[PDB]
Amino acid sequence: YALMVSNYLNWMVRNLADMEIQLGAVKRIHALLKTEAESYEGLLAPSLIPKNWPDQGKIQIQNLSVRYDSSLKPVLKHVNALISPGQKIGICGRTGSGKSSFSLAFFRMVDMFEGRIIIDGIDIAKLPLHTLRSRLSIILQDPVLFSGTIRFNLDPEKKCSDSTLWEALEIAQLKLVVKALPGGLDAIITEGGENFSQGQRQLFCLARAFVRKTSIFIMDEATASIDMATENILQKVVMTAFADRTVVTIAHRVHTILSADLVMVLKRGAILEFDKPETLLSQKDSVFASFV
Secondary structure (H helix, E strand, O other): OHHHHHHHHHHHHHHHHHHHHHHHHHHHHHHHHHOOOOOOOOOOOOOOOOOOOOOOOOEEOEEEEEEOOOOOOOOOOOEOOEOOOOEEEEEEOOOOHHHHHHHHHHOOOOOEEEEEOEEOOEEOOOOOHHHHHHOEEEOOOOOOOOOOEOOOOOOOOOOOOOOHHHHHHHHHOOHHHHHHOOOHHHOEOOOOOOOOOHHHHHHHHHHHHHHHOOOEEEEOOOOOOOHHHHHHHHHHHHHHHHHHOEEEEEEOOOOOOOOOOOEEEEEOOEEEEEEOOOHHHHHOHHHHHHHO
């Protein structure tokens, strides 16, 4: 045994250094589980007290601001605007203050909501986190395409079996795209939409709106898009305004959101000037000059 003492002494020290990697391995996990925030639950019974499926999308916000940096230096400052039910309001702003601050409150994406927000008579605080955005369709700036089957991508969350969304998506644009894939309904995404139209991702939201019954729609400016993509965006907004009777358009182009029921803009982290009609902002040349 004495002869083995030296041999095993090296082995014990060798493993002790190796266990240090294991000791640090749990450190990366312990820190992750140390802090918990943004629980996905309603305040009290957020399943039946609110509307089953809001359609008008009326917003009653009084001195409402969006804060994320521990309620210090928030990007919004007491935004108190009443939405117009039955119409689509296009809030056009050069910066994201009009868009990002408003979007976060609508989907409860703001860590701190310095105010009270009510959607179709239902408060955001007492509403489900998933249902807040489930009925509030939204799109990003650049196209985003996932990888998987069409039936698992067109209606991923809803898992609806209706084939009208596929026809509606094809009717809007990229009708021949479906015919290219032999699978059709079960066709998988070609490398997550590596080679497809930029507006196809936006067109996916339109099909989801007709499938998931997401009345509220959120629009974002497209960094890259075709000339006809803007026309499709205007057509989709008109369909959402006519049918869903609720849509929020956010873009950096004044002309794109010019044909809107209401025009809003935020500057310097607060509400600089908002126009109830569409031609009220057209009277002032400052808005047009800033856009172009």
